[PDB]
Structure formats: structure tokens, C-alpha cells
Amino acid sequence: REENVYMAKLAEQAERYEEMVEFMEKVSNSLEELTVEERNLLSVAYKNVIGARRASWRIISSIEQKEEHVNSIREYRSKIENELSKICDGILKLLDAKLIPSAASGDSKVFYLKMKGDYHRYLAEFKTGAERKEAAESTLTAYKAAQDIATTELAPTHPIRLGLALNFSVFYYEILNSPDRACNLAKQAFDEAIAELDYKDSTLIMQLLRDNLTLWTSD
Amino acid sequence: REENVYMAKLAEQAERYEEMVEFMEKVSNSLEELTVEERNLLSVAYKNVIGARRASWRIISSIEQKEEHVNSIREYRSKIENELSKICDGILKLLDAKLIPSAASGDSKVFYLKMKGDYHRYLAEFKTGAERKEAAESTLTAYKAAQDIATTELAPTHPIRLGLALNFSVFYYEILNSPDRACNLAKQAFDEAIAELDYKDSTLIMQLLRDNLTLWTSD
Amino acid sequence: RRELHTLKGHVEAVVKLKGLDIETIQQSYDI
Amino acid sequence: RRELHTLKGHVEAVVKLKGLDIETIQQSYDI
Numbered sequence: 001r002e003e004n005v006y007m008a009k010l011a012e013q014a015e016r017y018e019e020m021v022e023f024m025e026k027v028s029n030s031l032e033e034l035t036v037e038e039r040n041l042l043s044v045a046y047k048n049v050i051g052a053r054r055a056s057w058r059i060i061s062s063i064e065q066k067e068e069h070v071n072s073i074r075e076y077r078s079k080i081e082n083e084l085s086k087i088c089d090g091i092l093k094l095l096d097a098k099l100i101p102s103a104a105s106g107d108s109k110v111f112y113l114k115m116k117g118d119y120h121r122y123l124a125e126f127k128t129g130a131e132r133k134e135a136a137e138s139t140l141t142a143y144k145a146a147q148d149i150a151t152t153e154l155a156p157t158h159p160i161r162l163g164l165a166l167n168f169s170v171f172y173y174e175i176l177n178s179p180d181r182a183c184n185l186a187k188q189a190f191d192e193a194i195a196e197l198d199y200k201d202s203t204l205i206m207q208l209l210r211d212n213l214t215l216w217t218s219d
Numbered sequence: 220r221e222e223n224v225y226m227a228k229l230a231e232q233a234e235r236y237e238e239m240v241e242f243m244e245k246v247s248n249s250l251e252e253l254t255v256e257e258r259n260l261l262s263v264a265y266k267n268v269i270g271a272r273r274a275s276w277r278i279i280s281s282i283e284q285k286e287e288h289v290n291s292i293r294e295y296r297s298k299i300e301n302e303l304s305k306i307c308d309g310i311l312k313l314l315d316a317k318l319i320p321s322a323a324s325g326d327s328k329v330f331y332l333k334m335k336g337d338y339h340r341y342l343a344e345f346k347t348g349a350e351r352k353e354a355a356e357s358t359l360t361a362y363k364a365a366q367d368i369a370t371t372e373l374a375p376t377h378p379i380r381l382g383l384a385l386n387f388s389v390f391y392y393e394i395l396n397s398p399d400r401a402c403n404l405a406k407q408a409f410d411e412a413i414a415e416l417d418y419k420d421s422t423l424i425m426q427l428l429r430d431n432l433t434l435w436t437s438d
Numbered sequence: 439r440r441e442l443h444t445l446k447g448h449v450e451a452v453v454k455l456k457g458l459d460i461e462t463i464q465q466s467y468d469i
Numbered sequence: 470r471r472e473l474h475t476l477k478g479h480v481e482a483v484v485k486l487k488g489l490d491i492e493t494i495q496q497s498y499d500i
């Protein structure tokens with residue numbers, strides 16, 4: 001165990017994330033109640049692996065749109081997307097299998113639940129048919145299932161409480177394509193964060209929320 | 220052809236370089252006198268693919284050193300290095316096979332020759348035995364073979380003329396571990412660049428040269 | 439921080455450097 | 470530009486962000 005953790009921090013440092021995911025996979029299966037550290041390593045691993053694709057993805061899609069040739073591009077995006085479904089598919093089972101099932105506290109549960117919604121969400125970013133839908137749904141049910149715990153077991157300023165809010169609110173506006181319900185979740189989350197402002201991780205999230213509004217309020 | 224070029228620019232944009240190398244490989248073999256553009260795409264492709272490794276490499280090695288555990292690290296670096304030899308090995312044959320053999324002008328020749336020295340040099344960065352040596356040698360013979368053409372067929376301000384100088388001068392100081400001969404090549408190259416300063420690509424190289432000295436002159 | 443810890447920031451960085459003159463691809467800020 | 474177009478610049482960027490407190494790994498500027 002101590003090795004994969006370590007071997008993981010290497011892949012991190014080295015910035016060889018895909019390999020960072022593996023060392024972590026090992027860690028999870030090689031297991032009890034996964035530790036904050038490991039938890040936050042498995043994420044960052046998947047965060048980056050996945051992240052790299054969405055980025056490659058968007059630009060691509062962005063270039064594809066411009067053209068309208070397009071044939072080839074789509075081909076590429078095809079290849080790319082394929083990768084997405086993978087990482088997503090990967091992290092998800094690991095969620096259902098080992099992670100969630102063990103959760104013994106708010107953060108943990110709120111944390112994972114949150115993850116489970118995010119990748120389901122990422123799946124919603126490019127899927128088009130039955131999948132696309134079952135995702136949006138799965139997204140919603142996931143975040144909501146989390147929100148019930150956070151808004152109740154976590155302080156309105158707690159990073160997670162905030163982290164969830166932010167993404168959830170990007171799920172609505174961007175996935176379900178319904179600006180209204182989003183903003184409220186945004187603003188609501190933001191306000192009740194203030195009403196108790198009396199750090200660093202939270203503060204940086206509250207900032208992203210305001211940016212989302214002012215941005216969603218300007219189209 | 221037009222496709223792989225294009226398909227290449229995608230991988231570029233997308234920032235999926237390894238794939239950018241392939242599209243290019245296709246391009247080379249699918250061939251005449253490779254065009255400036257394609258030439259400079261094949262490079263950037265290899266530049267980045269390779270580049271990513273050296274970086275992962277250094278940090279790693281850097282972390283390995285600190286420790287003195289180290290066992291595992293080395294294992295990783297092992298894996299990493301393995302990759303290096305590959306890209307290098309790849310670009311090199313392509314050099315001997317298609318590229319060089321056709322060169323019909325200073326830049327081209329000076330250009331490639333330059334490439335051939337660089338990767339040979341990159342091979343010198345981590346190899347240890349007979350290989351390491353044959354590399355340093357191959358490095359030298361490569362750059363020198365180039366220098367004979369540049370310093371003669373190119374203007375002292377010409378990027379390549381400069382590009383070569385810079386690296387060549389990092390070969391000495393860093394590979395052969397002989398500061399003296401380096402600086403002169405550095406300074407010499409820098410001066411004769413000025414003596415005619417009367418843009419953008421060159422100017423940015425002359426700056427790197429000065430940085431190397433002041434840096435090599437301070438240890 | 440924003441271009442360090444968000445897909446949006448990163449995307450905006452790359453697209454700018456890449457001289458990519460394609461027109462703004464809308465996106466929000468997601469952790 | 471230097472952290473954009475040189476292994477040295479890049480390495481120095483990452484190492485800093487990664488809070489990597491290992492001590493300077495010497496390196497020159499190579500195109």
C-alpha cells in the first residue's frame with residue numbers, strides 16, 4: 001500500500017497521471033476506510049486524466065464547428081471521446097464497488113456522491129442518445145443525493161458543501177440547459193456561505209460561483 | 220498527404236502530440252523535398268513528445284537524488300527512460316532514411332544535421348555505458364557537421380545558425396562537461412550575431428545565449 | 439489558480455497561445 | 470516564452486507549482 005501511494009506521488013510529481021490512476025486503483029482494491037490523502041489522490045489522478053480529454057475535446061469540437069474536412073475532425077473527436085467513456089466508466093465502478101459502500105461520514109459520502117455526479121456529468125458532456133439521458137438523470141440523482149447530506153451535515157462554508165454547489169450548478173445551466181434553477185443554487189449556496197464568512201479552499205470556490213453568475217447573467 | 224498534415228495540426232491544436240508524430244511519420248514516408256511547414260511540424264511533434272519525458276525525467280531523477288525507497292524511483296525512471304530511447308531512436312532513422320539524404324540547402328541540411336545532434340544529445344542525457352559515449356561522439360560529429368555549413372551558408376543572425384550554436388554549446392558544457400569550449404561557442408556565436416544586428420525568432424535565441432553564459436559564469 | 443484548477447481556465451490558456459482564432463467556446467467554472 | 474519554449478523554463482514552472490522542495494536541478498537553455 002505505502003508503495004502505490006508513494007509510487008502515486010511520483011506519477012503526480014512526474015506528471016504522469018494515467019499511471020497515477022493505476023497506482024491508486026491498486027490502492028483502492030488493495031483495501032477499509034480510504035484515507036483523506038488517498039481519496040484526494042485518486043481524484044486528482046482522475047481529475048487530470050479526464051481533464052486532459054475534455055480540453056482536447058472542446059478545442060476539437062470548437063474547431064469542427066468553425067469549419068461548417070469536418071469528416072476527419074469528427075473522426076478524431078470520436079477517438080478522443082472513446083477515451084472519455086473509459087476513464088469515466090473506470091472511476092464509476094470503483095465508486096459503486098469499493099468507495100461509496102464504505103463511506104462513514106458526511107465529507108466522504110458528500111465527497112464521493114459528488115464525484116459520482118461529476119463523471120456522470122462528464123459523460124453527459126458528449127453522449128447523445130439513451131446514454132446522454134441516463135447520464136443527466138444519473139448526474140442529478142447523484143448531486144441531489146449528495147446535497148441532502150451536505151446542506152445538513154456540513155457548514156455552508158465547507159469546501160465540499162461549496163464544491164458540490166458549484167458543479168451541481170454547472171450541471172443545470174450547462175447539462176439540463178436551464179439557467180434559472182442554476183443561478184439560485186449558485187446564489188443560494190454563495191449567500192449562506194457568506195452569512196457565516198466570519199479558508200483558501202472555500203474562499204477560492206465562492207469566487208468561482210460569483211464568476212459563474214455574472215457570466216450566466218450576461219450572455 | 221494534405222490530410223496527415225491537417226490531421227497533424229489537429230493533434231497539435233488538441234495537444235495530442237504523440238499522435239502528431241504519427242500523422243507526420245505518415246507524411247514523411249508518404250514521400251521529395253519535405254516542406255518548411257511539415258519539417259517544422261515533425262520537429263514540434265517530436266520536440267514535445269520527447270520534451271515531456273526529459274521533464275518527467277529530471278524531476279524524477281531530482282527526487283531520486285534527494286532521498287539518498289530510491290529503489291522504486293529508479294524503477295520508474297527506468298520505465299521513463301525506456302520511452303526516451305524510443306522517440307529518439309524513431310526520429311533518428313527517419314533522419315538517416317528520408318530526411319537528410321534529400322536535403323538540398325543550408326537550412327534544411329543545417330536544420331536536420333542539427334536535429335540529428337539534438338536527439339543524439341538527448342540520448343546522451345541518460346545513457347551510461349557504450350551507448351552514452353557513442354552518443355556524445357555522434358552528438359559532436361552531428362553538430363560540427365552542421366556548423367561547417369551554417370557558419371558558412373547562413374547569416375550569423377539566422378535563427379538556425381543561432382539555434383545550432385545554443386544547443387551545441389549546451390552539448391559541451393552539459394554533455395562533455397567542459398565549460399570553456401562551450402562559452403566561446405556561445406559568445407562567439409552571440410557576438411557575430413550582433414556585429415550584424417542592424418527578427419523575433421533570432422532575437423529570442425540570442426537572449427538564451429546570454430542567459431547561458433551569465434549562468435555558466437556564476438556556478 | 440483559475441487556469442491551474444479549472445478546465446475553463448486551462449482551455450482559455452491553450453487556445454490563446456495556440457493563436458487559435460476560432461471563436462469563444464462557451465464554458466463555466468467547474469472544480 | 471522561456472517557460473513556453475524551453476525544457477528549463479517548463480521544469481522550473483512545474484517544480485515550483487508542485488511545491489516540490491527538492492533543491493535546484495541545474496540546467497541550461499536549449500531550444
Ligand SMILES: O=C(C1=C(O)C(=O)N(c2ccc(O)c(C(=O)O)c2)[C@H]1c1ccc([N+](=O)[O-])cc1)c1ccccc1
Pocket residue numbers: 036040044107108111114158159160162163164201443469
Ligand atoms: O475540503 C476538503 C479538501 C480536501 O480534502 C482537499 O484535498 N482539498 C483540495 C486541496 C487542494 C486542491 O487543489 C483541491 C482541488 O482539487 O481543487 C482540493 C479540499 C477539496 C474540497 C473540495 C473538493 N471538491 O469538491 O472538488 C476538492 C478538494 C476536505 C476536507 C475534509 C475532508 C475531505 C476533504
Ligand SMILES: O=C(C1=C(O)C(=O)N(c2ccc(O)c(C(=O)O)c2)[C@H]1c1ccc([N+](=O)[O-])cc1)c1ccccc1
Pocket residue numbers: 255259263326327330333377378379381382383420474500
Ligand atoms: O529559422 C527558421 C524557423 C522556422 O522555419 C520555424 O518554424 N521556426 C520556428 C518558429 C516558431 C517556433 O516556436 C520555433 C521553435 O520551435 O523554437 C521555431 C524558426 C526556427 C529556427 C530555429 C529552430 N531551431 O534551430 O530549433 C527552430 C525553428 C527557418 C527559416 C527558414 C527555413 C527553415 C527554418
